[PDB]
Amino acid sequence: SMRILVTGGSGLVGKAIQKVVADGAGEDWVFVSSKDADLTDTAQTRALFEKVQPTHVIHLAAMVGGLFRNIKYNLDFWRKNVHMNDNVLHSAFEVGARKVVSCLSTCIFPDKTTYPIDETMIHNGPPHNSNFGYSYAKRMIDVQNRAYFQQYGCTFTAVIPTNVFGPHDNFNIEDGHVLPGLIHKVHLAKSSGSALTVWGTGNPRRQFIYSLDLAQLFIWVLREYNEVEPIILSVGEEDEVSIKEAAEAVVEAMDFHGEVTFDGQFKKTASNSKLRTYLPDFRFTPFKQAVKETCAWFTDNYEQARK
Amino acid sequence: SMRILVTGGSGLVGKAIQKVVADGAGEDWVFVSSKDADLTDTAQTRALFEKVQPTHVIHLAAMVGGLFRNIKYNLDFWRKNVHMNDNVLHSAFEVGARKVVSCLSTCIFPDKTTYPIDETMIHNGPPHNSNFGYSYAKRMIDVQNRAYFQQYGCTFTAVIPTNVFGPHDNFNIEDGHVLPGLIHKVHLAKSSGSLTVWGTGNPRRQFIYSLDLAQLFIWVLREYNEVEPIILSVGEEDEVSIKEAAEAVVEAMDFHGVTFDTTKSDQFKKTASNSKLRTYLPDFRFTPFKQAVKETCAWFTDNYEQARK
Numbered sequence: 001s002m003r004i005l006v007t008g009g010s011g012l013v014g015k016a017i018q019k020v021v022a023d024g025a026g027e028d029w030v031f032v033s034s035k036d037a038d039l040t041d042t043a044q045t046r047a048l049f050e051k052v053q054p055t056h057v058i059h060l061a062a063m064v065g066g067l068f069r070n071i072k073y074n075l076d077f078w079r080k081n082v083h084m085n086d087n088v089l090h091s092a093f094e095v096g097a098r099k100v101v102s103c104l105s106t107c108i109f110p111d112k113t114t115y116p117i118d119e120t121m122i123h124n125g126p127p128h129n130s131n132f133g134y135s136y137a138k139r140m141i142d143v144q145n146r147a148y149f150q151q152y153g154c155t156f157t158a159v160i161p162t163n164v165f166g167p168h169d170n171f172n173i174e175d176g177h178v179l180p181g182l183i184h185k186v187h188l189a190k191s192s193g194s195a196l197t198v199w200g201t202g203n204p205r206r207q208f209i210y211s212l213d214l215a216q217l218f219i220w221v222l223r224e225y226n227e228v229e230p231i232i233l234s235v236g237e238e239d240e241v242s243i244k245e246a247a248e249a250v251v252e253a254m255d256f257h258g259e260v261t262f263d264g265q266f267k268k269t270a271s272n273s274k275l276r277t278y279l280p281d282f283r284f285t286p287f288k289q290a291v292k293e294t295c296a297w298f299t300d301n302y303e304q305a306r307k
Numbered sequence: 308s309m310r311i312l313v314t315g316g317s318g319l320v321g322k323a324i325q326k327v328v329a330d331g332a333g334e335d336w337v338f339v340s341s342k343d344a345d346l347t348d349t350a351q352t353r354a355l356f357e358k359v360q361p362t363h364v365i366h367l368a369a370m371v372g373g374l375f376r377n378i379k380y381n382l383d384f385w386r387k388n389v390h391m392n393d394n395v396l397h398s399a400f401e402v403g404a405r406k407v408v409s410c411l412s413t414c415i416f417p418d419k420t421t422y423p424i425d426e427t428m429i430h431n432g433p434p435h436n437s438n439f440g441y442s443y444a445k446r447m448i449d450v451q452n453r454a455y456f457q458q459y460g461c462t463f464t465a466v467i468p469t470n471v472f473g474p475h476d477n478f479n480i481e482d483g484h485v486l487p488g489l490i491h492k493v494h495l496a497k498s499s500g501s502l503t504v505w506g507t508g509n510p511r512r513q514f515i516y517s518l519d520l521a522q523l524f525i526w527v528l529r530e531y532n533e534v535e536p537i538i539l540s541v542g543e544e545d546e547v548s549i550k551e552a553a554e555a556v557v558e559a560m561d562f563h564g565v566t567f568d569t570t571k572s573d574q575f576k577k578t579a580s581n582s583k584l585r586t587y588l589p590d591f592r593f594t595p596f597k598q599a600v601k602e603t604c605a606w607f608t609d610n611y612e613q614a615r616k
């Protein structure tokens with residue numbers, strides 16, 4: 001008998017976890033996504049934890065977005081995220097939560113670094129200075145986790161997904177998630193003429209993880225896995241696709257037949273061999289099928305979707 | 308014209324700034340803190356800042372002490388310090404403060420590094436794991452300064468003193484501040500038969516006398532407008548071994564009874580570069596090490612009862 005509290009249950013990763021149907025199955029699952037509780041307010045946050053009395057917490061909530069927009073607000077990404085993370089982790093502690101699993105991103109790793117990055121390298125140099133406020137707030141999560149563990153022996157971890165995509169993503173072209181950016185562009189291009197890309201070489205490579213797959217692995221991390229050192233959740237370091245190959249998959253999936261044309265990292269390779277030490281028999285949804293499914297979702301949910 | 312708020316005004320560094328008398332002078336120096344306001348509390352911190360309406364802030368206050376003890380509290384050191392820093396920096400942001408200067412110690416720098424360290428190396432690798440909590444919280448002040456600058460154009464900064472000593476230090480032997488602990492050990496020595504000190508005596512350290520530091524702080528507040536921090540330290544050409552620090556203290560206090568106790572702690576170097584201060588202040592001169600020790604030994608004996616021991 002456990003009650004799982006999911007912060008940011010209404011975003012890309014949260015909506016994916018809300019299935020779970022099929023079925024998660026045991027567990028009382030509580031999804032929150034708010035207001036309902038502004039995790040930036042300590043009063044509202046402790047109140048939220050006092051009401052529901054989580055035994056387990058999956059922490060997805062974060063101040064994100066604008067993040068890939070060129071005008072930066074590094075004080076805001078820093079202050080807002082640090083408050084939320086402290087509020088959430090420490091409220092969890094105070095009501096006696098047994099486990100908290102938070103979420104970091106690969107873009108917070110040292111800008112320098114040799115590839116592939118692994119879970120031990122997160123603090124080994126300063127992040128890229130673009131979004132340093134966001135990057136250091138996320139890094140501090142690992143720092144909080146290790147502190148809780150040192151002083152009270154609590155088990156609080158984090159997962160490190162690569163680039164997540166899927167239904168309920170941010171499809172707003174301006175704020176720059178590249179995959180859902182592509183889906184939206186192709187959709188605009190069909191009902192007009194010519195069109196593409198999201199501009200650039202198309203050469204840069206990313207590891208993409210389908211939100212539905214991430215949801216599976218996240219429920220496993222919650223149920224099992226008790227390191228405090230984070231775990232990279234991602235497809236193999238040889239299953240990256242270039243942006244060009246991502247556009248080719250979207251164009252294929254949406255049956256777009258117009259012109260493409262082109263004119264960032266250029267790679268952030270992450271190893272998933274810790275994951276492979278635990279789950280060697282787990283298989284990711286093929287990229288092309290995952291793209292095709294999130295394309296179909298976009299077209300059948302155009303009115304409801306984020307931009 | 309210029310109202311100046313100093314948190315941690317009752318600490319070693321703060322007490323030294325309160326002179327000034329001597330004479331700083333234009334100004335208006337508001338020495339507070341003393342947890343007459345608990346800087347851990349957003350409400351009280353705000354109220355204090357709304358009450359006094361500073362244009363400048365020397366943020367000295369921090370959660371230290373117990374820091375060098377054997378049993379570690381990284382969660383507390385992290386949370387409390389992060390809260391203080393945020394509270395202070397942002398409350399000062401909200402009252403429209405023209406400038407903020409904070410303090411980092413060299414403790415927080417990467418455990419694995421080349422020497423000498425300079426201002427651009429603070430984030431180049433993880434601090435020693437003993438006190439990661441305190442170390443990362445200090446580092447985040449730098450992150451915080453850059454954020455106010457980038458997003459608002461404000462000039463918040465930090466100075467990085469090497470090992471500060473002087474009047475009003477923590478002379479407690481368990482809170483193992485090396486130099487105050489020597490001074491205090493020699494005193495419990497004379498007041499009986501015979502040391503210690505702990506370790507081999509070989510490790511080298513850069514010490515700065517509080518009153519030297521007080522005068523650079525004032526300057527940094529008045530001049531200095533970079534968000535990149537500034538190391539406040541004597542040169543690398545200087546630097547004294549723990550043995551030489553014990554000797555100077557032995558002389559100063561006329562002790563005649565030593566031994567080292569191979570067994571205890573011991574990095575063996577934390578060498579910081581002062582190039583940037585030497586560029587701004589080529590003619591500034593520190594008080595000599597031997598005199599400064601004597602002067603603080605004297606203050607210690609003259610103020611025993613009312614000292615942190």
Ligand SMILES: NC(=O)C1=CN([C@@H]2O[C@H](COP(=O)(O)OP(=O)(O)OC[C@H]3O[C@@H](n4cnc5c(N)ncnc54)[C@H](OP(=O)(O)O)[C@@H]3O)[C@@H](O)[C@H]2O)C=CC1
Pocket residue numbers: 007008009010011012013014032033034035037038039040059060061062063064065084103104105106160161162163164165168169170
């Ligand atoms: N998407 C990606 O590519 C990657 C994401 N991650 C991490 O995964 C997590 C999930 O991201 P994702 O699902 O993509 O993000 P989304 O932006 O899609 O979802 C954001 C969630 O955060 C919540 N939230 C934001 N601000 C607050 C607040 N003040 N109080 C309460 N809730 C708030 C939102 O709730 P509301 O709707 O109520 O605003 C929403 O549920 C994030 O923490 C992210 O950093 C990690 C690696 C890659």
Ligand SMILES: NC(=O)C1=CN([C@@H]2O[C@H](COP(=O)(O)OP(=O)(O)OC[C@H]3O[C@@H](n4cnc5c(N)ncnc54)[C@H](OP(=O)(O)O)[C@@H]3O)[C@@H](O)[C@H]2O)C=CC1
Pocket residue numbers: 314315316317318319320321340341342343344345346347367368369370371372391410411412413467468469470471472475476477
């Ligand atoms: N060698 C050194 O000593 C070095 C120090 N530094 C940094 O420089 C600063 C100077 O430290 P120093 O003066 O030596 O240390 P002290 O311990 O003497 O000073 C502590 C000061 O902080 C105040 N304080 C502590 N907790 C709180 C709180 N919750 N609210 C308000 N005030 C609080 C204390 O006030 P009260 O008396 O009321 O508790 C006291 O005024 C420190 O921040 C340190 O990190 C950097 C490099 C070297």
